[PDB]
A paper describes a structure:
Here we describe extendable linear, curved and angled protein building blocks, as well as inter-block interactions, that conform to specified geometric standards; assemblies designed using these blocks inherit their extendability and regular interaction surfaces, enabling them to be expanded or contracted by varying the number of modules, and reinforced with secondary struts. We construct twistless helix repeat (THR) protein blocks from identical straight α-helices (typically 2–4 helices in each unit); the length of the blocks can be varied simply by varying the number of repeat units. Restricting helical geometry to ideal straight helices with zero helical twist in principle considerably limits what types of structure could be built, but this is more than compensated by the great simplification of downstream material design, as illustrated below. Using X-ray crystallography and electron microscopy, we validate nanomaterial designs ranging from simple polygonal and circular oligomers that can be concentrically nested, up to large polyhedral nanocages and unbounded straight ‘train track’ assemblies with reconfigurable sizes and geometries that can be readily blueprinted.
Numbering used by the authors:
A (entry chain L): 1 to 307
B (entry chain g): 1 to 314
C (entry chain m): 1 to 162
Write the structure that this text describes.
Amino acid sequence: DDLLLKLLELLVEQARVSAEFARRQGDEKMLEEVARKAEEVARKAESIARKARKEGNLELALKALEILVRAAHVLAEIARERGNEELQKKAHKLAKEALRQVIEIAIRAIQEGNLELAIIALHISVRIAEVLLETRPDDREEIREQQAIFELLIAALEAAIRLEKLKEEGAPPEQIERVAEHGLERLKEIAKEISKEVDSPESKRIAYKIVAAAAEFLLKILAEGGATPEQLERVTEHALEVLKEVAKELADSPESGLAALAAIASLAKLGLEQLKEIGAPPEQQRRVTKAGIEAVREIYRYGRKLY
Amino acid sequence: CDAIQAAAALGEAGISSNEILELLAAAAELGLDPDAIQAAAQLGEAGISSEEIKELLRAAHELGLDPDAIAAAADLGQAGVSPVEILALLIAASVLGLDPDAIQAAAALGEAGISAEEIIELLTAARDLGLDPDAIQAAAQLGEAGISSEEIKELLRAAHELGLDPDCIAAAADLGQAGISSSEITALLLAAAAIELAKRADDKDVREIVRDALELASRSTNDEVIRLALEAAVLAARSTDSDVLEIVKDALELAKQSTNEEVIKLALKAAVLAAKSTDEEVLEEVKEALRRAKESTDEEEIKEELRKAVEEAE
Amino acid sequence: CDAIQAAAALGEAGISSNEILELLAAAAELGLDPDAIQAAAQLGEAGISSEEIKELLRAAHELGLDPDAIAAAADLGQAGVSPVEILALLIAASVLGLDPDAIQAAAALGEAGISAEEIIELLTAARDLGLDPDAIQAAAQLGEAGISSEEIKELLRAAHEL
């Protein structure tokens, strides 16, 4: 595939040199042609990107998204020279979908643990921000929402890489505990702060799923570290507790309830799979199950304030 | 007499006398019936811990679950689903307002081993699409056919747009077990539905349009052109309007004449949007745009006239 | 649902997506019914090529064969009769004015392994002698008994003369 993706890059560059010609000399038919050609590129890239999503190749998906941003850059300049609304509307719609897609891929990249793909995804997200910032003369709230998600992902990655450094160094379980413990604290405080300013339901759903994926990463790092069942208990309880109170902040609806439930209980199920793998005794299995069920109980009884 | 059989079942499951008494104490406080208690005995035979069953009983009462919703926990337990995952499915099904048939279809998705988040998102999708439980049962059959969860969402979104019956979704699961790709299953759904409609309404113009679409689709190396042409065939086979028939026949004839995939997609997309739409002035302007195209001296004028029509109708 | 289930049967027969779409193009042009399409699927399961089946369907329409004669095409196909000989047998019976029962007895002569020209001379003899279709069924049973076409013709000639 990469050869086709690079043909799109070459096409885009020829269009971009033609956009210099549109500044240096100018023609409506040239602007029309590069606009249409860039849409044809965008459709080619989108077609590859949907196939890459279905196949699960994140590297190709990120490459295709970056090419979609490269196309969006030239599209935005073409629209700026032409004074054109249709292209700017197309650009905002495409960029907003790309933001959602790259968010979902970035969640997946953190979930699979290849943080270099996540870093590349955030690089692309900065380029999406460059497009959005050029695109809107007016809207601040879209930028706030994107940047809040970015600040959350960055904070989660700062914890993730601090833990991964401890894991690479072979650090003692007590340091892994105190780092993870304060990681969950900082996640909670940042989520609480972000919850003051965000208001898009889909963004809130994203943000919660990100906090959940960050807790999941912390738990899986502790499992890769081979920690004691006492550590698995303490951290799982603190993690579910944080993820519950963050649910009590963010949750407002059946849609958010369903997410909170699915995430919390999946995280507890994954925790119980670590207890199964280490062979922890039945009282630990009961303790974790009770903590999980008491979270589900509290999620229902919080939800019953609204339902 | 029969209330003793629950104690016998729990004793055969190896539950101790004080645990049977404690479970009976909970069942008495909660007022739960002998078959709800039999479902608790089946969870005990599935190896679910007595102290977890106390939470399952409590939760069923605090939710106000009906006996069949309680019974579905035993099927999920014998499918190997955890007490907590059972609590997910039930707690969600309650706020979703699901009926026992939809809950039994969730138990079948549990027997298919689908992840609880994917089950709940599939249930949310079926709820938002306003579908009946047979669509959930057909989604479970697509799970038995091994179709990925967002491809189930594609097949549901397609079947909803196309007004198909649930047995077409069952036949899509049969095509999935035959190893056909989800895009090709969509093409087969489209073509077979267009011809099933043509068997109900065998008009010469319907037969010509459906044939010309199937021909153009069989000629095309591009599956966007296939899906456009076969969806246009479904819309024309449901239609009773001479303007839609003329517009679709002109677009298919122009697409059978032309050698450019872009003009082909423009003409078919314009005809599809005109057939989705319901405005006689848009239909008149589209028929005019097809005259302007067929009588054109320049292919760039074909492209820009069809673009202006598409970008007004979309 | 039924048309999608017929497509699933063509998928179980191993017919590719563009070949099903071409067979569906023929179904739309020729106005094929479900039992004619089921016969095309059974010709597919008998291993007749998609390109030949398109000629078989074209021929069945250009002849004006009825659905039971089209079903007999799949019976002759499962008997292993060559694709043009299916068309000859059906054409001959149709142009003689023979009925679906006589055609089914010709499919039984095909299952008995009788040569196509010998079937056609037997059908011509039964037609000229004015016999009922059970005489063709008896000719198939005499073929299963190993009696020669000359001796079947002698037995029918004797039975008619007496």
